[PDB]
């Protein structure tokens, strides 16, 4: 049970929706959340998530994706 936090470039609601769906596609993701005062962080929660593959996918499709944190939960 890991929780992964990702800064993603998603300036409008259409990109927040694309990023949410894109993270969800990745093996082990149970939930994805939008957080931060600037609506620019994904909190990805699941089991067995490959966080390098997760950030690479969001980076490829959103331009910017920074892995801020991985944590057990």
């Amino acid at each position: 049970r890991t929780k992964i936090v990702v800064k993603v470039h998603m300036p409008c609601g259409k990109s927040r929706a694309k990023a949410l769906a894109l993270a969800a596609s990745v093996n082990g993701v149970d939930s994805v959340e939008i957080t931060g005062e600037d609506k620019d962080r994904l909190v990805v929660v699941g089991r067995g998530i490959d966080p390098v593959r997760l950030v690479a996918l969001l980076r490829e499709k959103c331009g910017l994706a920074e892995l801020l944190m991985v944590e057990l939960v």
Binding site: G13, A17, K18, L20, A21, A24, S25, V26, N27, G28, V29, D30, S31, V32, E33, I34
Partner: protein, 61 residues
């Protein structure tokens, strides 16, 4: 697409939460149990916190 369905959750003017589920799976969303049928549709649709559940196959987003 490691799971068939994406359940979207609309509360307070935005979808800020989405959950995965296979068809005919029961997931938990916060304290609530949600059943997701063979068409990726979630039951109940309105959670007790008045948030609104929506679903479809993953590729349709």
């Amino acid at each position: 697409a490691w799971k068939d369905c994406i359940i979207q959750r609309y509360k307070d003017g935005d979808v800020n939460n989405i959950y995965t589920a296979n068809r005919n799976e029961e997931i938990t969303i916060e304290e609530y149990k949600v059943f997701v049928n063979e068409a990726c549709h979630p039951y109940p649709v309105i959670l007790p916190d008045r948030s609104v559940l929506s679903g479809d196959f993953t590729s349709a987003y």
